[PDB]
Design a protein around this ligand. Structure first.
Ligand SMILES: CC(C)CCC[C@@H](C)[C@H]1CC[C@H]2[C@@H]3CC=C4C[C@@H](O)CC[C@]4(C)[C@H]3CC[C@]12C
Ligand SMILES: CC(C)CCC[C@@H](C)[C@H]1CC[C@H]2[C@@H]3CC=C4C[C@@H](O)CC[C@]4(C)[C@H]3CC[C@]12C
Ligand SMILES: CC(C)CCC[C@@H](C)[C@H]1CC[C@H]2[C@@H]3CC=C4C[C@@H](O)CC[C@]4(C)[C@H]3CC[C@]12C
Ligand SMILES: O=C(COc1cccc(I)c1)Nc1cc(Cl)ccc1C(=O)O
Lengths: 555, 150, 49
């Protein structure tokens, strides 16, 4: 199995868990989980302490072991145990939140001594406990943390007005949980305010980049505006580099190459560096301008991910991410039909200007544009063209008026050319677009129910990442960077983690144990009231009656 | 009627996505081709209005493709320009990267006119199917209030 | 060896499906009905007492 060999390898030497494990109920529970004893795990859980934290840790280790399983059956057993176990854990935490909201809220951030001193939230995220993030209790607590010391009942427009007018903080609007200085730091350190500052800074960055690209990008040496834009770009590069380094050196970069949004930011920044180099070098000014235009497109795309936090939009964004397979199949089919129809028409009518770019244009671009209402009838039908004799080759040609429709086409089979145009319009503009409608509707209907749950996890990760992000905006985050490097240089000569009281820890443990035993007795009553169990009981009672009646049959 | 009132969230998300993609594509084309008439209203028109109208069958090929335009030498700046015939398409654009301009036009048409409209179809159908069953009940209450008010 | 393995797994599958059928509520209600009927019959066999 994966227990004896794992212990032998650890002795011969998740890795921290293996190191700490070697050959009060925590040890029994962990042994039950590693031995794949489902009933032992359940019972040790239910009669042991720290049920929620133990549940998150144990389901994390179940997922890890199922991934490590070389046997599909054992992996399936471990993973189904993990699903049932995370579900029952989240049910317990839901019934806990149903009792005392603030008690459960401070139960979350409780740094439990076991499982590597990691909070429940980090354990769930490492375990991919989407269901354990789904419940309204943890959702509301995450919302309040995103509104850290801001009384989340405040509306968004109040927040934007307060951001625009710093004096507005000391008003009746926007309540909150050196008083002026403390309020100032709370306002400017709240993760939601950090997010708003980042959004406004990014909008200003895009506006300035567009202004530079459309007006101030002459081949003259860079001006003050160009230098300032370069300064913002370098600051963003430093920001992303530090974020990747913080969130072991090579292991961290291998971790960072994931999270495709960071990949998009990285490729955008590399394109920016290439564009700056080409702009600075004399010869490649035009190439620099083109690549910077492409980079603007990439940055505008990244703005979407920056604006995925909205409660009504994130599921839709992950939906449109999921719809790529359907659009991609449609791309194949459209390409095939476009090749067929374009080559057919390019063979039926033979323009004199047979240059390769012109042939490729007439075979791909124009048929593609026929889909969206651009139909050059005067270019590809003879009855709309004036007849003339071009070449010595025997035929009737009727030179067109179009600039890139050819010098003059042939006309032997224009009836079948028009027939092909009709067929192509019927297939591409009717069969394909409406069939893509069908696939899009079906995919949305199937996927939305899991997309919203994935958005819950994504929003938790978003809250964590903006909490980890420093205070000042990217245009001024150079101050934060120099502050952190000074802190790095200060030690050379030398995550919410809300504190809980020591007696409060014991009171939370007792409260959680009491509510756990209440939930178990409730579920036991439910199982007893279940019709199948009742029929079981009736069957046994009837059997006992029959047996004891047989014991008096001799009378 | 109460359904179409409820559909505003979907149309509103679509408005966000269309605005983002329009900004991206418009600025890309406005940077790739550089009309001489760089007045602010003209720049804003070319970056927002014309790309928006490209969705509904208004494609100024003769305005933004060089192979359809007559070539001429406008300015001392080194390049080939090929002055357009359009009235508000610019005095004369540059032509260094019109292949990629046409590629961007193709990509924008594929995304906005195919991905977005059909995806909005999907959301509209799903929202209608989900909401009609309560919308009719709300209409019952609304009609009672209507009777009372008249 | 494949024949023996297949036969063993086949009889395992049949016994599993038999247990499933027995645990089925309809079959259980059948069994309860027959047990109640037998109890009634043998109680009638001692009615004369
Ligand atoms: C926030 C982003 C996405 C908006 C994109 C719109 C862009 C194209 C707009 C917004 C601000 C605009 C600039 C604002 C002011 C001027 C000064 C004027 O004398 C020349 C044009 C110029 C430089 C504008 C060009 C177009 C512009 C850059
Ligand atoms: C739906 C899909 C299959 C449609 C594909 C259309 C693409 C491939 C078409 C549309 C416009 C076309 C371009 C139009 C003009 C030029 C400039 C020329 O100097 C090189 C070829 C090039 C760059 C063409 C290559 C093919 C092209 C990019
Ligand atoms: C809705 C669908 C069915 C419409 C299809 C349009 C068809 C019927 C049209 C398109 C072009 C037309 C053809 C154009 C030219 C010719 C050549 C002539 O010597 C005989 C008539 C003939 C052959 C026409 C008959 C009708 C025609 C084939
Ligand atoms: O959805 C996302 C979110 O970032 C995006 C990055 C680029 C473009 C878009 I629109 C969104 N990225 C993913 C995209 C794919 Cl095609 C597959 C998986 C993921 C992922 O989230 O891992």
């Amino acid at each position: 199995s994966l227990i004896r060999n794992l212990l032998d390898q650890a002795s011969h030497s998740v890795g921290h868990v293996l190191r700490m494990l070697l050959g009060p109920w925590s040890d029994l529970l962990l042994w039950a989980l590693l031995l794949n004893r489902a009933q032992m795990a359940m019972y040790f859980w239910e009669m042991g302490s720290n049920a929620v934290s133990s549940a998150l840790g144990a389901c994390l280790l179940l997922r890890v072991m199922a991934r490590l399983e070389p046997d599909a059956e054992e992996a399936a057993r471990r993973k189904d145990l993990a699903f049932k176990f995370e579900g029952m854990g989240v049910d317990l935490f839901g019934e806990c939140y149903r009792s005392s909201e603030v008690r459960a809220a401070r139960l979350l951030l409780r740094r439990c001594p076991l499982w590597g001193d990691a909070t429940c939230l980090q354990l769930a995220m490492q375990a991919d406990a989407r269901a354990f993030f789904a419940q309204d209790g943890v959702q509301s607590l995450l919302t309040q943390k995103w509104w850290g010391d801001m009384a989340s009942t405040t509306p968004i427009w109040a927040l934007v007005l307060a951001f625009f007018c710093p004096p507005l903080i000391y008003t009746r609007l926007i309540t909150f949980r050196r008083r002026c200085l403390r309020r100032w730091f709370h306002f400017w350190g709240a993760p939601v305010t950090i997010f708003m500052g980042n959004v406004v800074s990014y909008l200003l960055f895009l506006l300035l980049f567009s202004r530079v690209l459309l007006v101030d990008f002459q081949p003259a040496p860079p001006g003050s505006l160009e230098l300032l834009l370069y300064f913002w770009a370098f600051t963003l590069l430093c920001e992303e580099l530090r974020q990747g380094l913080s969130g072991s050196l090579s292991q961290r970069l291998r971790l960072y190459l994931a999270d495709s949004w960071n990949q998009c930011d990285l490729v955008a920044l590399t394109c920016f560096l290439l564009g700056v180099g080409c702009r600075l070098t004399p010869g490649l000014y035009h190439l620099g301008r083109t690549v910077l235009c492409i980079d603007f497109m990439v940055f505008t795309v990244r703005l979407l991910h920056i604006f995925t936090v909205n409660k009504q939009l994130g599921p839709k964004i992950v939906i449109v991410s999921k719809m790529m397979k359907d659009v991609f199949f449609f791309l194949f089919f459209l390409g095939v039909w476009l090749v067929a129809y374009g080559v057919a028409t390019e063979g039926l009518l033979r323009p004199r200007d047979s240059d390769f770019p012109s042939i490729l244009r007439r075979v791909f671009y124009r048929p593609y544009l026929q889909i969206f209402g651009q139909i050059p009838q005067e270019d590809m039908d003879v009855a709309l063209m004036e007849h003339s004799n071009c070449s010595s080759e025997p035929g009737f040609w009727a030179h067109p008026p179009g600039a890139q429709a050819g010098t003059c086409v042939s006309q032997y089979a224009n009836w079948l050319v028009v027939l092909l145009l009709v067929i192509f319009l019927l297939v591409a503009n009717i069969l394909l677009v409406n069939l893509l409608i069908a696939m899009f509707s079906y995919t949305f209907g199937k996927v939305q129910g899991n997309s919203d749950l994935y958005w819950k996890a994504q929003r938790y990760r978003l809250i964590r990442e903006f909490h980890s992000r420093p205070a000042l905006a990217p245009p001024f985050i150079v101050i934060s960077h120099l502050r952190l490097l000074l802190r790095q240089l200060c030690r050379r000569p030398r995550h919410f983690r809300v504190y809980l009281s020591k007696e409060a820890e014991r009171k939370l443990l007792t409260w959680e144990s009491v509510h756990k035993e209440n939930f178990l007795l409730a579920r036991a009553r439910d199982k007893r009231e279940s019709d199948s169990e009742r029929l079981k009981r009736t069957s046994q009672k009837v059997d006992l009656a029959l047996k004891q009646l047989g014991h008096i049959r001799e009378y």
